[PDB]
Each structure stands twice: as C-alpha cells, then as structure tokens.
Amino acid sequence: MASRILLNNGAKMPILGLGTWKSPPGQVTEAVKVAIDVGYRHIDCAHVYQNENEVGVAIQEKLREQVVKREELFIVSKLWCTYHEKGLVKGACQKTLSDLKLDYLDLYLIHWPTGFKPGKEFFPLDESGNVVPSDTNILDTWAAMEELVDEGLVKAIGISNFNHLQVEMILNKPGLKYKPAVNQIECHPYLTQEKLIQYCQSKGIVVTAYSPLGSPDRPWAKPEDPSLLEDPRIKAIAAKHNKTTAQVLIRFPMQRNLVVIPKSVTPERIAENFKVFDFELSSQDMTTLLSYNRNWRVCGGLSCTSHKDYPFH
Numbered sequence: 383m384a385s386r387i388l389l390n391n392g393a394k395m396p397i398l399g400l401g402t403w404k405s406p407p408g409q410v411t412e413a414v415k416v417a418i419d420v421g422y423r424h425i426d427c428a429h430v431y432q433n434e435n436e437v438g439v440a441i442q443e444k445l446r447e448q449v450v451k452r453e454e455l456f457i458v459s460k461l462w463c464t465y466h467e468k469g470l471v472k473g474a475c476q477k478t479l480s481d482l483k484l485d486y487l488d489l490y491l492i493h494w495p496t497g498f499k500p501g502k503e504f505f506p507l508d509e510s511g512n513v514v515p516s517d518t519n520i521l522d523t524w525a526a527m528e529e530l531v532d533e534g535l536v537k538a539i540g541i542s543n544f545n546h547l548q549v550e551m552i553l554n555k556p557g558l559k560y561k562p563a564v565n566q567i568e569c570h571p572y573l574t575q576e577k578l579i580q581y582c583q584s585k586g587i588v589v590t591a592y593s594p595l596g597s598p599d600r601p602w603a604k605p606e607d608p609s610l611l612e613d614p615r616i617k618a619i620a621a622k623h624n625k626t627t628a629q630v631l632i633r634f635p636m637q638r639n640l641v642v643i644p645k646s647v648t649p650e651r652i653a654e655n656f657k658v659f660d661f662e663l664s665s666q667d668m669t670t671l672l673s674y675n676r677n678w679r680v681c682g683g684l685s686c687t688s689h690k691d692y693p694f695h
C-alpha cells in the first residue's frame with residue numbers, strides 16, 4: 383500500500399489524512415502538530431469548521447521547525463455554501479489561505495453542491511426556518527474554482543457531496559477547463575457507495591471517504607443509530623487481524639483505492655489511526671464489510687431537502 387494516489391492534475395495525494403471537523407480550537411493545534419510528528423502529511427480543513435486559524439498555527443510551526451517541507455504537505459479546504467457567487471470565491475479562498483498560513487492549497491473543494499444566500503450566517507434562514515438558496519449554479523461556481531487554479535491559489539480543485547448526476551453535470555460543462563480531481567463523500571461500511579465510487583473512478587476522479595468511523599461525535603447523534611466502532615461483526619475482523627476496530631475502518635477505504643480522513647484530537651488515537659500500512663484485509667473481509675451497507679448517513683442534510691441541488695434524493 384503506497385502512501386499516495388496520483389490525481390488527474392498530475393500531483394500525488396496522501397491516502398491518509400487528518401480530519402478537523404469538530405476538533406475544538408483549543409485542541410486542534412496540538413492535534414495537527416502530533417499528526418505531522420507521527421507521519422500525517424494531509425490535513426482536511428474547511429472554513430465552516432471555524433478552526434482553520436488554529437490548524438494553520440500547527441502547520442506553520444512544523445514548517446518553521448523543519449519537521450516537514452511545504453511541498454511534502456497536502457492541505458485541503460472547502461468553499462462554504464454562502465460563497466458560491468463568482469465575486470465571492472476568490473476572497474473565500476484567500477481567507478482560508480490567510481487562516482491556514484499558506485500561499486496555496488493543494489486541493490480546494492466545493493463543500494456542498496447547494497449554494498446559500500451570502501451574508502454572515504452560514505445557514506441563512508427565512509422566517510419559517512428554510513435555508514435561503516442562492517441562484518448561482520454548480521457550473522458557474524466551477525468556473526470560479528477554475529480561476530483559482532489559473533491564479534496560483536490552489537493546485538487542484540474538486541467537489542464534495544456531489545451525486546452521480548452532479549458529477550456528470552460538471553464533466554459535461556460547456557467549456558470545461560479542469561476536471562474535478564476529487565469527490566469527497568461520506569463512506570463507511572454502513573454507506574458503502576459502490577455506484578458513485580465506480581462512476582467517479584471510471585472518470586479518473588479520486589474519491590475521499592469522510593466520516594470513516596461513523597462520526598461518533600457528530601452533534602445530532604441519537605442512541606438508536608448504528609455504531610460502526612461498536613459493531614461486533616467489525617470488532618471480530620479487527621480481532622482476527624490483531625488491530626483495532628478503527629484501524630480496520632481506516633484500512634477498508636484504502637483498499638478500495640480511496641483516500642480516507644479520520645478525525646481525532648486524541649494523541650494516542652492520532653498515532654493509532656496512522657498505523658494502517660502494515661496489514662491487509664482479505665477480499666472476503668472486504669466483501670463482508672461491504673455487506674453491512676444500510677444507506678445510513680452521518681451527514682444527511684435533512685434541513686436542505688428542497689434545495690434544487692440537494693444531493694441525496
């Protein structure tokens with residue numbers, strides 16, 4: 383298992399990265415420092431996570447310390463929904479760059495296909511509680527992303543939470559200049575994504591799996607929800623291989639040619655989660671894990687279901 387995957391922009395992307403959604407601002411600097419110290423070279427970020435400044439402190443310190451060189455890091459961020467208009471994309475990218483202490487991003491994603499009304503609120507609401515859409519579509523937002531490549535702000539551009547038809551819309555865009563390098567989607571044994579993964583891979587788009595552990599710290603968790611880390615069937619595979627359940631859950635997407643971005647702020651788990659390059663799941667293990675699919679989503683976007691571009695109908 384090589385550590386990097388070749389993207390369709392000619393650059394290589396580390397297949398294991400550190401997630402940062404929900405990482406508290408007072409803990410994420412040390413989390414990223416530890417991650418870099420123990421071998422991580424890819425950090426997944428977003429403006430909406432409200433902690434990019436603190437992620438950036440860690441990156442800058444490790445560059446200053448010469449623990450790593452900038453060209454060895456692969457830093458990803460995402461354009462939030464309230465910045466889909468053409469005139470807002472560059473400034474949104476530049477705010478993320480400033481916060482992360484970077485001159486360029488390795489990859490910048492459209493975070494969700496849904497555009498929302500610009501303003502201070504990340505979820506602008508009407509008086510009845512619906513999110514207020516923007517009238518800017520995915521194709522014009524994509525053209526604005528292409529400009530960022532042509533200005534040197536980002537090395538690669540991609541998409542996130544785009545369904546099959548939305549990916550195809552991008553690929554079929556009149557005058558398309560750069561194909562998306564990545565589609566970052568939720569993926570784990572309860573949401574195995576065979577159809578969307580095969581489509582993206584067949585077009586040369588690399589898939590990144592988010593919430594690979596089932597996001598046990600998601601803010602909307604309910605007790606009746608299934609739990610990957612506690613599933614006896616997955617624990618049994620881990621025991622057979624003398625690895626933790628989390629390690630199995632991270633290795634699983636790796637063997638599907640996916641990138642995977644487990645989140646932790648716990649030093650011992652950050653290190654544990656990286657120790658996944660030294661064992662192999664069998665084909666039978668892989669098919670068994672795939673069999674657990676139930677189309678269960680951490681990020682279901684249930685408050686966004688009437689948006690013309692809601693992705694999960």
Ligand SMILES: NC(=O)c1ccc[n+]([C@@H]2O[C@H](COP(=O)([O-])OP(=O)(O)OC[C@H]3O[C@@H](n4cnc5c(N)ncnc54)[C@H](OP(=O)(O)O)[C@@H]3O)[C@@H](O)[C@H]2O)c1
Pocket residue numbers: 400401402403404426427493542543566567591592593594595596597598599600611626628629643644645646647648651652654655680681
């Ligand atoms: N593009 C998108 O729309 C989108 C959506 C969701 C997520 N993402 C990205 O994907 C990343 C990962 O997804 P996620 O944050 O939803 O959840 P996740 O990575 O599936 O799970 C994170 C949770 O698992 C715990 N954990 C981590 N390693 C563990 C281990 N070895 N043993 C036991 N528990 C462990 C963490 O606890 P501690 O931190 O307390 O250790 C945290 O509670 C995000 O942080 C974000 O970067 C992107």
Ligand SMILES: O=C(O)COc1cc(F)ccc1C(=O)NCc1cccc([N+](=O)[O-])c1
Pocket residue numbers: 403428430431463494496681682683684686689691692693
């Ligand atoms: O979107 C992520 O990366 C994780 O989830 C969130 C993180 C945040 F910091 C804030 C909000 C979310 C969240 O609600 N994310 C879910 C979401 C967002 C936008 C649109 C949709 N949609 O289905 O169209 C869904």
